[PDB]
Structures are given as C-alpha cells and as structure tokens.
C-alpha cells in the first residue's frame, strides 16, 4: 500500500510537470503573435 500511494504521487507529479511544460510552451506562441502585432503597430505609426 505504501508503494501504491507513492506511485500515485509520482503520477500526479508527472502530470503536473507536463502541464507546466505545456503552459510555458503556449506562452511562447502568444508572445510571438504579439510581436507581429507590435510590428504592425509601428508600421501604422510610420504611415501616420
């Protein structure tokens, strides 16, 4: 039963880590999109 609860904690952590990895990966995707937006924002000011 102790190996059991130990394994259970390992699994829950294994998944929690996968989640943080997923979230940081996603954050990068949004930053890149936002950079394209800022570039267009500058072009707009140049057009002004």
């Amino acid at each position: 039963t102790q190996f059991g609860s130990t394994l259970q904690n390992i699994i829950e952590r294994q998944d929690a880590e996968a989640l943080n990895a997923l979230l940081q990966n996603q954050a990068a995707e949004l930053i890149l999109t936002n950079l394209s937006i800022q570039d267009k924002t500058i072009e707009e000011l140049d057009a002004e």
């Binding site: 949004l30 999109t33 936002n34 394209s36 937006i37 267009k40 924002t41 072009e43 707009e44 057009a47 002004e48």
Partner: protein
C-alpha cells in the same frame, strides 16, 4: 489691362483652391493607407 489682370487674379484664387483639394486627395489617400495597416493589425489580433 486691368480687366486682363482681374482675370489673372481670379484664376490665382482658383489655383490655390484646386491645390487645396489636391492636397486633400493625397492626405486622405495616406489616411486610407494607415487605416489599411491598422486593419491588418486587427486581423492579427483575431489570429491571437
């Protein structure tokens, strides 16, 4: 001579006014361009 000059002066006013309209036609066009850029940025926002 006075009447001939009268016509020249009248024309000069028209010249200034067509030039005013002409300038507006270039500024407005530039405004359409900065608007087009803005629209593209707005599209990128849809993308994000």
């Amino acid at each position: 001579i006075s009447q001939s000059e009268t016509y020249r002066r009248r024309r000069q006013e028209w010249e200034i006014q067509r030039n005013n309209a002409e300038a507006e036609l270039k500024q407005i066009d530039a405004q359409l361009k900065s608007l087009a850029v803005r629209r593209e940025a707005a599209v990128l926002q849809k993308t994000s």
